């Protein structure tokens, strides 16, 4: 059982590079380029940008976007919330299905970290409760995109935009709506307090059961009693929607959902005593139900 | 800083099915050849004891569907190479990478496409352990999966999936058919030899760890014989003069001297993490090269 992205050609073949003075990647889709709006900045303008001003004094001439070895020619910019629209004359002959969405927290996706308009690795992340994601982003990687695939739809959710403080990141969905707190300036920004994922470590538990890690099964508890718990642990509480999504999982493995929050319960009071679960020595919550079930 | 797997657009357009009888897997598709592991020529009764050559030659190549998403391939021609089928077909794939054919060393890694009826469900970044078998995620119909390296625009393949052992942890070969380790493509009983942690990997990762700011675990110096011997006792692999060199360039991002990142280990492996993390592990992790560290870092 592996930490394991969707497989990653068909953003690929969608991933360009875009040039301001400032380079970052663009996701061409048919006739339009999307990518984060900070790429009309300067290092200066950085500090706190008027963007509709900025804009304005910026030409399309002004907009150097190559898909490759071809340069592409832009002939219209727009501003949508926090990401630039250019329309180019070309649009994308290896434009697959898609869709954009706006995921939740606690939702999964794969990142295709780019640089230079040119991919470079492809990795699982979790949306965290406080709305940003723990990345490995450098330089260059804004407008690198998350996304799930579902069928041969590419389902879009994140673009990267920047590093907080605290070297977690944050973005924006396909329409330029960040997620959390969060503006494209930089300027001091506090990410809430984090939480663990609560459903996603008890789909870990069940992949461990289904992989042979079965030690830590045992008691019982109520949804109410073990959220007490979950509380003092700094887990999110557990409600009756996410005992349904585990069902699938509770019925795998012939363990019922609250008496794996009882395991779980102990695991939290009593730690791991040195043993290990699927080869971690901590509690793993960036496996959705579905990621698990969708592996084995 | 996270595990990374490369971009898998090149290998997904290599994927293909194939099926013979009753048996269907994955078959890797360059040029005008179809590679893919000899078992899928063996029925279910066949697995126990399999005589391949035998078996093959009750087949034509009729006997062989390939299919390339909605596209049938016709096969003109079979071999067998070591554990690996080849099958030369009637199209050139014309979405062949420039690609090589590698063996890898233990303690490198790879990427691996995990694909069943020759479509791609995922991917993911394994090591190829001292003992030669692979922490992978395979399920039944896996088989013909392959592992690679991207350098450049050129896909580097060095795996291609055979089988799990009973321990669960995986075995294949090299594009050529030749399995890494001592493992043979029959359902007997098979040891993996005593594994070892890649003491070189675990360095670069605590360079990995200090460029990314997480220092608590720094100290004391340490001679290479000195730390070799404290290196046997724990299990991990001997530090060559070779590994200090291939370590050189974070040794110089860093300013600390392998010599000294050695002392640290040492301590680490002596004295436990006490609860601390590093890179937000509670364990010591070998499955990054210096290589690996580098191109994130
Ligand atoms: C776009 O490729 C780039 C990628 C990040 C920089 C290094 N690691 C990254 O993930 N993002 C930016 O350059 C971005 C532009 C702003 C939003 C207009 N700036 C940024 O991320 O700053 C990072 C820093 C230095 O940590 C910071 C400093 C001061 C205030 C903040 Cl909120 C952040
Ligand atoms: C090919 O798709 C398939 C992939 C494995 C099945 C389950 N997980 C896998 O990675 N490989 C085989 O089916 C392989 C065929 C042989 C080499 C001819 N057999 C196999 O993997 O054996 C696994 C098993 C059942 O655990 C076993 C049983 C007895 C002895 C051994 Cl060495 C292995
Ligand atoms: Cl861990």
Redesign the pocket.
């Known amino acids: 059982f592996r930490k394991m992205a969707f497989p990653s050609g068909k953003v690929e073949g969608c991933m360009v590079q875009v040039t301001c003075g400032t380079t970052?990647?663009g996701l061409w889709l048919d006739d339009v380029v999307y990518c984060?709006r900070?790429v009309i900045?300067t290092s200066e303008d950085?500090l706190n940008?008027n963007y509709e001003d900025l804009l304005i004094r910026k030409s399309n001439h002004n907009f150097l976007v190559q898909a490759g070895n071809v340069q592409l020619r832009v002939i219209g910019h727009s501003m949508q919330n926090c990401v630039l629209k250019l329309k180019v004359d070309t649009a994308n002959p290896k434009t697959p299905k898609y869709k954009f969405v706006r995921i939740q927290p606690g939702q999964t996706f794969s990142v295709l970290a780019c640089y230079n308009g040119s991919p470079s690795g492809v990795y699982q992340c979790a949306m965290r409760p406080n709305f940003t994601i723990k990345?490995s982003?450098?330089?260059?990687?804004?407008?690198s995109v998350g996304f799930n695939i579902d069928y041969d739809c590419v389902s879009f959710c994140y673009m990267?935009?920047?590093?907080?403080?605290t070297?977690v990141?944050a973005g924006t969905d396909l329409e330029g709506n960040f997620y959390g707190p969060?503006?494209?300036?930089?300027?001091?920004?506090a990410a809430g307090t984090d939480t663990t994922i609560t459903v996603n470590v008890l789909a870990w538990l069940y992949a461990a059961v289904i992989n042979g890690d079965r030690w830590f099964l045992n008691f019982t508890t109520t949804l109410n009693d073990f959220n007490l718990v979950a509380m003092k642990y700094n887990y999110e509480p557990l409600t009756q929607d996410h005992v349904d999504i585990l069902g699938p999982l509770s019925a795998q493995t012939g363990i019922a959902v609250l008496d794996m929050c009882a395991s779980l319960k102990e695991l939290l009071q009593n730690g791991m005593n040195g043993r290990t679960i699927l080869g971690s020595a901590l509690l793993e919550d960036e496996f959705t139900p579905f990621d698990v079930v969708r592996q084995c």
């Open positions: 970052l990647n984060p900070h900045c950085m940008p990345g982003f450098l330089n260059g990687s804004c407008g990267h935009h920047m590093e907080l403080p070297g990141h969060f503006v494209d300036r930089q300027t001091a920004q």
